[PDB]
Amino acid sequence: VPDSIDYRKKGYVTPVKNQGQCGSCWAFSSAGALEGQLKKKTGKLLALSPQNLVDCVTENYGCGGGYMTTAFQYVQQNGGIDSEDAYPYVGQDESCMYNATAKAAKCRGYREIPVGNEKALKRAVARVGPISVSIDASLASFQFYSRGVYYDENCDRDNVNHAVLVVGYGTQKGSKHWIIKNSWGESWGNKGYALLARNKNNACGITNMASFPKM
Amino acid sequence: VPDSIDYRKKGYVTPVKNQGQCGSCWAFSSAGALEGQLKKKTGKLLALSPQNLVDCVTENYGCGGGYMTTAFQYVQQNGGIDSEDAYPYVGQDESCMYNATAKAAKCRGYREIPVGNEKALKRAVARVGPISVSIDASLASFQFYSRGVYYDENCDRDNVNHAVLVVGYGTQKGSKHWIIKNSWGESWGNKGYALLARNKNNACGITNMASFPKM
Ligand SMILES: *[C@@H]1O[C@H](CO)[C@@H](O)[C@H](O)[C@H]1NC(C)=O
Ligand SMILES: *[C@@H]1O[C@H](CO)[C@@H](O)[C@H](O)[C@H]1NC(C)=O
């Protein structure tokens, strides 16, 4: 297990998008994990559709929230998920318009990472790929993030409310970190990405909901 | 295990091509198997490049012959294979021009089917997908094939010289068969396909070299 990894450099990460006024953060995270795994299994980087998840995952809340595990389960039981080109993101709720002919990726279940265990998360990122996680984004310090390794002892490490995609880890000037891909556009953070305090005892609760799809 | 299957109907089979004046039959077979498996793993049907195999598999003979297993091993160790669009078929030998950025499929080893065991071949086709095989095509009866279930007791069930892709099995008017995809264009056989005598004691030696890739 490497001391550093950046899946952005391995071509596992799709360009940063903006979820707009819609709680589809879980959709982008799930789509990102499935994209990374699709890349790992095929070698082809292909933008999958979070909108498909928003509309067709009937056990999530569409633009009102949801989980990544439920999305993976959806992709598995439905027998596929559409590409971004075939099923574009519009940022609002609508009926399920899944085109099975536009099928571009499949799933075979999911795996959850043991709560509180950042070691298992690092091992996962190392051996699996971009891991779908969820953190506490409510703090203005996160809203105003722009550079460095993010940390705040006020950050809730127990209650969690925002899905992002861990695309690697490393260290910047002594401070260990998680590289996270957010869905608030390139106008937020470091062009859509952020560095999060690693090994600071589950900072922002990055291990409360860490999951990844199988292919 | 079904009594019949047609992967052409499941959208696992790429349109029939013509290998021209080049012994790249093994390339089309391997590419076909990898295409079927790529479809099974992703749900996307994508034409892979036999030319890539012809040029880059250095343990085969290019347009002079080769094995499918060696091709699978190539795709595995090289870490990918190009699409047909990126690496078109030209029907002649040339240098390896593999574009790793054009990577569209990967492999993780291969499996050979026990020689003489058509049962294991049927089970394979059922549980895996289109199986790369090789048969005896030398007979004029095969060259002039057009309809029915092909059979000839003069067909060599021991010595084998032509790679095709078993894309399913079934029965036509009492006679059990293997659906095979050849690479002699749509101007041969049933628009490029043929039905081969099944359970006629390894007819044309269809189990002498039956193999499939893993993904
Ligand atoms: C479904 O999606 C495919 C994606 O390639 C598209 O080509 C086709 O026009 C669509 N057809 C239907 C059934 O709406
Ligand atoms: C390699 O292939 C890719 C396939 O998309 C193509 O876009 C690119 O122009 C090629 N580049 C090189 C290194 O020749």
XYZ file of C-alpha atoms and ligand atoms in Angstrom:
458
model
C 0.000 0.000 0.000
C 1.613 3.237 -1.293
C 2.162 6.310 0.883
C 0.534 8.351 -1.878
C -1.814 7.927 -4.831
C -3.661 10.237 -7.214
C -6.233 8.602 -9.478
C -6.605 11.927 -11.274
C -3.166 11.184 -12.706
C -4.136 7.620 -13.621
C -7.043 8.901 -15.699
C -9.697 7.457 -13.401
C -11.435 10.767 -12.736
C -14.066 12.555 -14.838
C -14.023 16.400 -15.055
C -15.662 18.194 -12.115
C -19.358 18.980 -12.539
C -21.822 21.222 -10.707
C -24.834 19.587 -9.060
C -26.598 22.953 -8.996
C -29.676 23.365 -6.816
C -30.187 19.633 -6.314
C -29.203 17.168 -3.591
C -27.628 14.837 -6.140
C -24.229 14.765 -4.428
C -24.718 11.041 -3.816
C -25.352 10.571 -7.534
C -22.059 12.167 -8.578
C -20.176 10.187 -5.932
C -21.671 6.865 -7.014
C -21.176 7.713 -10.677
C -17.579 8.637 -9.894
C -16.847 5.361 -8.126
C -18.461 3.396 -10.956
C -16.424 5.453 -13.434
C -13.177 4.664 -11.644
C -14.022 0.973 -11.457
C -15.073 0.948 -15.115
C -11.683 2.464 -15.922
C -9.938 -0.169 -13.805
C -11.801 -3.018 -15.507
C -11.688 -1.739 -19.096
C -9.050 0.983 -19.327
C -11.628 3.338 -20.791
C -12.620 6.507 -18.959
C -16.300 7.189 -19.564
C -18.622 9.707 -17.913
C -21.569 7.871 -16.372
C -24.937 9.489 -15.672
C -25.777 10.753 -12.162
C -29.143 11.905 -13.537
C -30.034 8.273 -14.198
C -29.433 7.611 -10.509
C -31.403 10.689 -9.446
C -34.449 9.601 -11.444
C -34.379 5.804 -11.326
C -33.101 4.955 -7.837
C -36.540 4.638 -6.264
C -35.164 4.045 -2.767
C -33.331 7.363 -2.749
C -34.801 10.871 -2.676
C -33.712 12.166 -6.083
C -32.674 15.797 -5.704
C -33.611 15.518 -2.032
C -30.795 13.216 -0.965
C -29.779 9.566 -1.009
C -27.107 6.961 -0.326
C -24.380 5.618 -2.614
C -24.882 1.999 -1.551
C -28.528 2.131 -2.618
C -27.385 3.551 -5.954
C -24.903 0.712 -6.458
C -27.651 -1.753 -5.599
C -29.816 -0.019 -8.191
C -27.165 -0.293 -10.901
C -26.782 -3.970 -10.032
C -30.467 -4.938 -10.037
C -31.339 -2.790 -13.057
C -28.499 -4.424 -14.962
C -26.702 -1.268 -16.024
C -26.333 2.504 -15.999
C -26.326 5.058 -18.823
C -23.526 7.344 -19.974
C -23.602 11.093 -19.374
C -23.961 11.667 -23.119
C -27.016 9.414 -23.350
C -28.617 10.605 -20.103
C -27.391 14.192 -19.446
C -27.563 15.922 -16.059
C -30.233 18.618 -15.840
C -30.194 19.160 -12.082
C -33.860 18.500 -11.342
C -36.260 15.654 -10.564
C -38.002 13.812 -13.398
C -39.295 10.378 -14.420
C -37.005 7.402 -14.999
C -35.816 7.614 -18.606
C -33.277 4.782 -18.534
C -32.303 3.581 -22.013
C -31.056 -0.001 -21.692
C -29.506 0.277 -25.155
C -27.380 3.137 -23.817
C -26.025 0.768 -21.154
C -22.360 1.585 -20.542
C -21.510 0.056 -17.160
C -22.680 -2.664 -14.773
C -22.366 -3.385 -11.058
C -22.128 -6.550 -8.961
C -22.841 -5.366 -5.439
C -20.989 -3.034 -3.103
C -18.656 -2.992 -0.116
C -18.856 -0.728 2.922
C -15.753 0.419 4.789
C -15.697 -0.201 8.589
C -16.800 2.977 10.379
C -13.931 4.889 11.968
C -11.187 2.914 10.238
C -9.198 5.315 8.046
C -6.588 2.600 7.593
C -9.114 0.387 5.802
C -10.149 3.404 3.735
C -6.544 4.034 2.662
C -6.077 0.350 1.854
C -9.327 0.478 -0.120
C -8.287 3.536 -2.137
C -4.975 1.789 -2.783
C -6.335 -1.595 -3.887
C -9.754 -0.665 -5.282
C -9.847 2.887 -6.614
C -11.884 6.077 -6.061
C -14.051 5.397 -3.000
C -17.479 6.988 -2.599
C -17.632 8.650 0.809
C -19.693 11.214 2.684
C -18.507 14.027 4.969
C -19.647 17.086 6.922
C -19.729 20.031 4.511
C -21.949 22.357 6.550
C -19.159 24.537 7.967
C -18.468 27.844 6.221
C -14.776 26.956 6.411
C -15.503 24.176 3.922
C -17.746 26.412 1.816
C -14.861 28.876 1.590
C -12.193 26.222 1.014
C -9.549 27.130 -1.568
C -6.162 25.646 -0.652
C -4.175 23.562 1.834
C -5.264 20.548 3.853
C -8.740 21.216 5.258
C -9.281 20.752 8.983
C -11.683 22.056 11.614
C -12.259 20.591 15.071
C -15.823 21.912 14.830
C -16.399 19.556 11.895
C -18.921 16.879 12.844
C -17.192 13.491 12.828
C -20.403 11.729 13.856
C -23.158 13.338 11.785
C -22.582 13.377 8.035
C -24.392 15.192 5.212
C -22.452 15.439 1.926
C -21.208 12.817 -0.529
C -17.846 13.262 -2.242
C -15.401 10.951 -4.006
C -12.029 10.100 -2.459
C -9.729 9.823 -5.474
C -6.479 9.301 -3.579
C -4.307 10.270 -0.624
C -0.891 11.632 0.313
C 0.848 14.328 2.339
C 1.271 18.076 1.858
C 3.927 19.822 3.966
C 3.720 17.328 6.823
C -0.068 17.105 6.917
C -1.508 13.803 5.677
C -4.618 14.122 3.520
C -7.429 12.641 1.442
C -7.903 13.944 -2.083
C -11.636 14.482 -2.501
C -13.662 15.278 -5.602
C -16.708 17.419 -4.898
C -19.636 18.340 -7.142
C -19.870 22.090 -6.544
C -18.142 22.941 -9.815
C -14.590 24.055 -10.551
C -15.416 27.407 -8.963
C -15.102 25.811 -5.525
C -11.939 24.696 -3.745
C -8.950 23.702 -5.844
C -10.811 23.586 -9.163
C -13.464 21.317 -7.671
C -11.110 19.258 -5.514
C -10.076 19.452 -1.867
C -7.500 18.064 0.550
C -8.966 16.727 3.791
C -7.214 16.055 7.106
C -6.244 12.381 7.251
C -5.541 10.496 10.496
C -6.940 13.398 12.515
C -9.374 10.904 14.060
C -12.039 10.554 11.350
C -11.990 14.243 10.417
C -15.413 15.374 9.167
C -16.526 11.738 9.418
C -15.017 10.552 6.143
C -15.403 6.917 7.226
C -19.027 7.094 8.380
C -20.251 6.166 4.898
C -17.358 4.884 2.794
C -18.432 2.478 0.055
C -17.355 1.158 -3.350
C -18.986 -0.797 -6.223
C -17.896 -4.136 -7.672
C -17.570 -4.980 -11.368
C -27.601 -24.685 -18.748
C -30.088 -23.835 -21.549
C -30.799 -26.152 -24.484
C -30.247 -23.162 -26.763
C -28.532 -19.775 -26.779
C -27.749 -17.115 -29.374
C -25.423 -14.325 -28.267
C -26.138 -12.572 -31.559
C -29.567 -11.872 -30.084
C -28.087 -10.689 -26.784
C -26.013 -8.081 -28.601
C -22.695 -9.739 -27.792
C -21.586 -10.107 -31.405
C -19.886 -7.546 -33.660
C -20.775 -7.435 -37.406
C -18.968 -10.011 -39.562
C -15.689 -8.844 -41.095
C -13.421 -10.175 -43.840
C -9.857 -11.118 -42.905
C -8.861 -10.893 -46.566
C -5.551 -12.392 -47.657
C -4.179 -12.686 -44.125
C -4.035 -15.494 -41.565
C -5.586 -13.275 -38.905
C -8.461 -15.656 -38.159
C -7.089 -16.062 -34.633
C -7.162 -12.283 -34.230
C -10.859 -11.989 -35.080
C -11.692 -14.921 -32.805
C -9.796 -13.471 -29.847
C -11.212 -10.013 -30.497
C -14.678 -11.552 -30.665
C -14.323 -13.354 -27.345
C -12.964 -10.203 -25.703
C -15.857 -8.255 -27.238
C -18.420 -10.663 -25.824
C -16.803 -10.581 -22.396
C -16.559 -6.785 -22.516
C -20.282 -6.740 -23.273
C -20.958 -9.110 -20.378
C -18.939 -6.988 -17.947
C -20.064 -3.535 -19.101
C -23.201 -3.924 -21.205
C -21.536 -2.012 -24.017
C -20.866 -3.673 -27.360
C -17.620 -2.330 -28.784
C -15.581 -3.520 -31.765
C -12.060 -4.367 -30.617
C -9.034 -4.388 -32.918
C -7.761 -7.675 -34.401
C -5.074 -5.655 -36.203
C -3.602 -4.736 -32.825
C -3.268 -8.451 -32.128
C -1.806 -9.154 -35.571
C 0.914 -6.539 -35.103
C 1.664 -6.577 -31.378
C 1.350 -10.235 -30.352
C 5.031 -11.047 -30.794
C 4.571 -14.739 -29.998
C 2.131 -15.219 -32.859
C 2.818 -15.068 -36.598
C 0.796 -11.996 -37.566
C -0.874 -12.670 -40.908
C 0.847 -16.058 -40.906
C -1.140 -17.634 -38.088
C -1.358 -17.715 -34.307
C -3.225 -18.877 -31.215
C -6.028 -17.177 -29.285
C -4.571 -18.024 -25.873
C -1.338 -16.223 -26.742
C -3.424 -13.235 -27.823
C -5.308 -13.191 -24.519
C -1.989 -13.399 -22.701
C -0.824 -10.454 -24.796
C -3.867 -8.351 -23.918
C -3.283 -9.193 -20.261
C 0.438 -8.395 -20.085
C 0.192 -5.312 -22.305
C -2.579 -4.003 -20.074
C -5.176 -3.416 -22.763
C -6.311 -3.608 -26.374
C -7.441 -0.911 -28.811
C -10.833 -0.425 -30.437
C -11.418 -1.085 -34.131
C -11.978 2.637 -34.690
C -8.637 3.554 -33.121
C -6.677 0.686 -34.687
C -8.460 -0.299 -37.951
C -7.949 -3.616 -39.748
C -5.915 -3.338 -42.947
C -5.279 -7.034 -43.546
C -1.484 -6.976 -43.682
C 1.565 -7.168 -41.417
C 3.021 -3.988 -39.922
C 4.759 -2.637 -36.815
C 3.072 -2.477 -33.414
C 1.138 0.796 -33.299
C -0.682 0.265 -30.001
C -2.089 3.491 -28.552
C -2.467 3.004 -24.795
C -4.729 6.059 -24.672
C -7.078 4.239 -27.051
C -7.320 1.410 -24.506
C -10.864 0.027 -24.551
C -10.651 -3.421 -22.948
C -8.466 -5.445 -20.582
C -7.838 -9.125 -19.888
C -6.967 -11.148 -16.787
C -5.796 -14.471 -18.166
C -7.565 -17.198 -20.107
C -9.178 -20.607 -19.721
C -8.823 -23.589 -22.038
C -11.637 -26.090 -22.550
C -10.767 -29.802 -22.010
C -10.002 -31.398 -25.385
C -12.810 -33.597 -26.687
C -15.381 -32.430 -24.146
C -18.241 -30.760 -26.033
C -20.262 -30.797 -22.823
C -17.761 -28.465 -21.152
C -17.834 -26.301 -24.274
C -21.634 -26.020 -24.115
C -21.481 -25.238 -20.399
C -18.815 -22.633 -21.163
C -20.869 -20.952 -23.895
C -23.804 -20.969 -21.481
C -22.028 -19.525 -18.433
C -19.248 -17.470 -20.029
C -20.179 -16.233 -23.493
C -18.783 -16.426 -27.050
C -15.931 -18.951 -26.901
C -12.904 -18.665 -29.181
C -12.392 -22.005 -30.908
C -10.566 -23.470 -33.884
C -11.809 -26.019 -36.434
C -10.949 -27.764 -39.703
C -11.989 -25.462 -42.549
C -9.928 -27.048 -45.330
C -12.752 -29.068 -46.906
C -14.467 -27.585 -49.960
C -17.769 -28.520 -48.324
C -17.016 -25.868 -45.707
C -15.779 -23.394 -48.319
C -19.097 -23.835 -50.120
C -21.212 -23.764 -46.955
C -24.468 -21.813 -47.237
C -27.203 -23.380 -45.096
C -28.146 -26.175 -42.695
C -26.055 -27.850 -40.017
C -22.579 -28.514 -41.426
C -21.187 -32.032 -41.162
C -18.614 -34.134 -42.993
C -17.035 -37.358 -41.752
C -13.957 -36.411 -43.783
C -13.528 -33.364 -41.541
C -10.362 -33.701 -39.470
C -11.310 -33.965 -35.796
C -7.659 -34.257 -34.765
C -5.796 -31.696 -36.872
C -7.139 -28.151 -36.713
C -6.379 -25.057 -38.808
C -8.970 -22.255 -38.577
C -10.124 -20.052 -35.703
C -13.788 -19.088 -35.399
C -16.010 -17.819 -32.593
C -18.730 -20.014 -31.088
C -21.500 -17.540 -30.274
C -24.101 -20.058 -29.123
C -25.760 -23.424 -29.677
C -29.112 -25.086 -30.313
C -30.912 -27.495 -32.627
C -32.200 -27.203 -36.194
C -34.660 -29.860 -37.388
C -33.345 -32.551 -35.051
C -29.659 -31.846 -35.627
C -27.854 -30.254 -32.675
C -25.400 -27.504 -33.593
C -22.840 -24.849 -32.690
C -23.396 -21.336 -33.990
C -20.029 -20.161 -35.289
C -18.909 -16.726 -36.427
C -16.298 -16.830 -39.171
C -14.162 -14.047 -40.638
C -14.596 -14.674 -44.365
C -17.109 -11.856 -44.769
C -20.888 -11.905 -45.100
C -20.467 -13.366 -48.583
C -19.714 -16.754 -47.027
C -22.132 -19.128 -45.312
C -25.218 -17.676 -43.672
C -24.110 -14.039 -43.881
C -20.791 -14.890 -42.247
C -22.159 -17.440 -39.786
C -22.424 -21.227 -39.834
C -24.091 -24.094 -37.989
C -21.733 -26.924 -37.055
C -22.574 -30.514 -36.099
C -22.703 -30.770 -32.307
C -22.304 -34.044 -30.384
C -21.151 -35.795 -33.555
C -17.982 -36.738 -31.657
C -15.929 -33.524 -31.817
C -16.941 -32.712 -35.394
C -14.168 -30.802 -37.190
C -12.293 -30.728 -33.873
C -14.172 -27.811 -32.330
C -12.819 -28.702 -28.880
C -9.151 -29.078 -29.834
C -8.516 -25.397 -29.111
C -11.453 -23.913 -27.210
C -10.498 -20.952 -25.026
C -11.963 -17.816 -23.440
C -10.597 -14.620 -21.811
C -11.244 -13.350 -18.289
C -12.153 -9.784 -17.319
C -31.734 4.751 -26.639
O -30.380 5.098 -26.442
C -29.528 4.775 -27.517
C -28.098 5.081 -27.083
O -27.220 4.770 -28.142
C -29.927 5.646 -28.700
O -29.085 5.422 -29.811
C -31.371 5.361 -29.095
O -31.802 6.315 -30.041
C -32.331 5.358 -27.908
N -33.507 4.599 -28.295
C -34.647 4.568 -27.609
C -35.301 3.227 -27.423
O -35.164 5.578 -27.133
C -3.845 7.868 -29.482
O -5.169 7.384 -29.542
C -6.141 8.265 -29.025
C -7.480 7.535 -29.035
O -8.475 8.394 -28.525
C -6.188 9.484 -29.936
O -7.179 10.400 -29.519
C -4.832 10.178 -29.952
O -4.817 11.170 -30.955
C -3.666 9.218 -30.174
N -2.465 9.860 -29.670
C -1.226 9.428 -29.892
C -0.282 9.415 -28.721
O -0.844 9.046 -30.997
